[PDB]
Design an enzyme around this catalytic site. Structure first.
Site, PDB file in Angstrom:
ATOM      1  CG  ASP A   1      -1.925   1.088   1.225  1.00 48.17           C
ATOM      2  OD1 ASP A   1      -2.013   1.833   0.224  1.00 48.17           O
ATOM      3  OD2 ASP A   1      -2.676   1.192   2.219  1.00 48.17           O
TER       4      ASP A   1
ATOM      5  CD  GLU B   1      -0.362  11.644   0.699  1.00 50.36           C
ATOM      6  OE1 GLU B   1      -1.003  11.242  -0.307  1.00 50.36           O
ATOM      7  OE2 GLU B   1       0.878  11.831   0.697  1.00 50.36           O
TER       8      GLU B   1
HETATM    9 NA    NA Z   1       2.596   1.758   3.568  1.00 55.56          NA
END
Ligand code: NA
Ligand code: NA
Lengths: 313, 310
Positions: B168, B197
């Site tokens: 991820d 983000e």
């Molecule tokens: Na990560």
């Protein structure tokens, strides 16, 4: 600093939609900070310096504004305030929505009698916004329910004063950025560009241990006609140092420090009379919560100097 | 794709410090893209093709990690999470910082009873990182306050599965790189390796497809129905609030999968420009040992190549 203030005040950032302001802050700080991060709650944290003493400078990043709550059959929008927008400040005004749409604020009432009774006790439910749409479908594609808007007003110089929307508290954001651009810190310095929870909800120092936290805010400049108040803050009186009624011993120490720094370096300042130890330093501002908030640049420069003298090597 | 996934997952790239990830992406893409730019926030945008339709594939380049928030008189570091790091995932683990400094995560508590109490409700304030320093001065030279650390874990193949840190979303980055390596595009194809983000992409595209990871709920006692599983194929995200155009992208991808015989699974609902999300089933997300099945990654690459290719 004038261009910095213009960019930050003109940026789109009503409560909950402050991404453009964070972007401007980060781009302005490129090469002037050692790091940055966003905490879970949305606060933007930057830092510079390696001194043993740790100090937070904190300014709010959101501005007041409106949100679309309904679209009628003819394409007119209903709105409600986000923050302290008075309906009286919106009459005949233009609003800029997040996607760039411009709308005109109108008031209900056809007869002179109806309109006069409506302005006498003006409320949001008597206002509407015209975005040029001729149907609900047209308006929904342009400005769906839930869209945020801000004053469609920008930065202008008024004989040496600076006027713009969102001086509260983009001028505080500007002070912190400028301090970071200039300072050789004697401390580990944190800049926090903070979010605020809606009134009614749980609310948030931040995610950083520090010895001192100084809020950089605005305060009402009560130096306009017929102001008859003791303790009045005024433009060109310098940063307003807040005397808090219930302040801790450690908080009063910060306030006394700032007074000594100001006096020793010949910096104008004024005393404002109404967890991490804290102090508040405020920019005197006229016409707070209007689209034409006004500051004196020498107050802002004095505030930056005060912070640099206090925190710099 | 093995070496590409090894390089991208092992690269140092906590939020705000992803220079090494961007460098690897451009090295892997050289001779496969028409151009690129890195904007003022650090988004890496690449493009290939000249079709009239403009499509963005997006994956984020940051990985979860920690940030140093204090240093004590004996050189021990206090830390806070950056992203979704559980304190339980850090106990006795090694953390790598940007200059190669390795630290060991310890927990406070001298006696067994203190330690038993602390792990019952473990919090970051009971953790510290030992970087081998013997004073604040020694520690501040190696790892000043504000330093970011990532897991000191790397890539390993486990009976045909790939395991690493930062699947991820380095696996989504890998998918986008592999698409650009192979595709002859019918569209103008943009690849956005994003850091968005950081502020909570200057390309006016017609569609955006996010390439993400989703939890693979096929481990013991996983009883959720319609769970995403390894080797079930790209996970296509169902959206309730989606516009007609966003739903159309998802319907297009379903049609591609069926017409090209590509395995796929639907990530069900739990209660901008048009967009869809395609995710790689991943076990142990947010641990140092995130696990994917290579056939899912390959199926995801194939799905995008067949949807977007000439
Ligand atoms: Na990560
Ligand atoms: Na390249």
């Amino acid at each position: 600093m004038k261009e910095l203030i213009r960019k930050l005040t003109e940026a789109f950032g009503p409560s909950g939609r402050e991404e453009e302001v964070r972007s401007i802050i980060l781009e302005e700080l490129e090469g002037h900070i050692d790091g940055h991060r966003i905490d879970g709650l949305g606060n933007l944290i930057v830092w510079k310096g390696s001194g043993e003493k740790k100090v937070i400078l904190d300014a709010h990043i959101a501005e007041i504004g409106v949100v679309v709550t309904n679209v009628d059959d003819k394409g007119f929008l209903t709105i409600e305030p986000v923050g302290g927008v008075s309906p009286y400040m919106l009459l005949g005004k233009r609003i800029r929505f997040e996607n760039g749409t411009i709308g005109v604020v109108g008031m209900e009432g056809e007869t002179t009698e109806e309109r006069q009774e409506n302005v006498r006790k003006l409320s949001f439910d008597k206002l509407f916004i015209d975005i040029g749409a001729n149907s609900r479908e047209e308006a929904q594609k342009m400005c769906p329910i839930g869209s945020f808007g801000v004053y469609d007003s920008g930065f202008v110089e008024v004989s040496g004063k600076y006027v713009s929307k969102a001086m509260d508290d983009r001028i505080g954001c500007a002070v912190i950025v400028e301090v970071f651009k200039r300072i050789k810190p004697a401390v580990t310095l944190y800049g926090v560009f903070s979010v605020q929870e809606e009134v009614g909800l749980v609310g948030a120092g931040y995610g950083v241990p520090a010895d001192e936290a100084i809020a950089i805010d605005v305060t009402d400049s009560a130096d306009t006609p017929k102001a008859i108040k003791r303790h009045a803050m005024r433009l060109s009186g310098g940063p307003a140092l807040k005397v808090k009624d219930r302040a801790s011993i450690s908080s009063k120490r910060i306030l006394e420090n700032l007074i000594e720094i100001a006096e020793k370096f010949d910096i104008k300042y004024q005393m404002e009379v109404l967890g991490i130890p804290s102090a508040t330093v405020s920019i005197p501002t006229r016409y707070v919560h209007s689209p034409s908030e006004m500051i004196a640049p020498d107050d802002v420069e004095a505030t930056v100097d005060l912070l640099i003298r206090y925190l710099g090597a």
